[PDB]
């Protein structure tokens, strides 16, 4: 049978957040001009120029 | 500065060589064994000025 005392409850949550699914559109992304691209050793790959 | 243009012009101005049939690696190997040579004293004094 229905008892109001064992059935009333205060539920708690947040207010107005926003989930983000992509997580990598927030990274602005550029590159060195590829004639100046270097390796791990900071020497230029494609030395040949 | 990619130095294929200098050695390509170098084989242009020699009036014998079919320069469109000499590909990259020979042009760049002429670059490799051409900058081992000392500059003529005229153009060396010009570059010093």
TrEMBL record, chain B:
It comes from the Viruses. Sumoylated with SUMO1 and SUMO2. Sumoylation of viral proteins seems to have a positive role on viral replication. It is found in: Virion. Homodecamer; each decamer is made up of two conformers of VP2, called VP2A and VP2B. Interacts with a VP1-VP3 complex. Interacts with the intermediate capsid protein VP6. Interacts with NSP5. Interacts (via N-terminus) with NSP2. The N-terminus binds RNA. It is necessary for encapsidation of VP1 and VP3. The N-termini of 10 VP2 molecules form a cylindrical hub underneath each 5-fold axis of the inner capsid. Inner capsid protein that self-assembles to form an icosahedral capsid with a T=2 symmetry, which consists of 120 copies of VP2, with channels at each of its five-fold vertices. This capsid constitutes the innermost concentric layer of the viral mature particle. It encapsidates the polymerase VP1, the capping enzyme VP3 and the genomic dsRNA, thereby defining the core. Belongs to the rotavirus VP2 family. This is Inner capsid protein VP2. It comes from Rotavirus A. The gene is VP2. The chain holds residues 638 to 686 of 882 of the full protein.
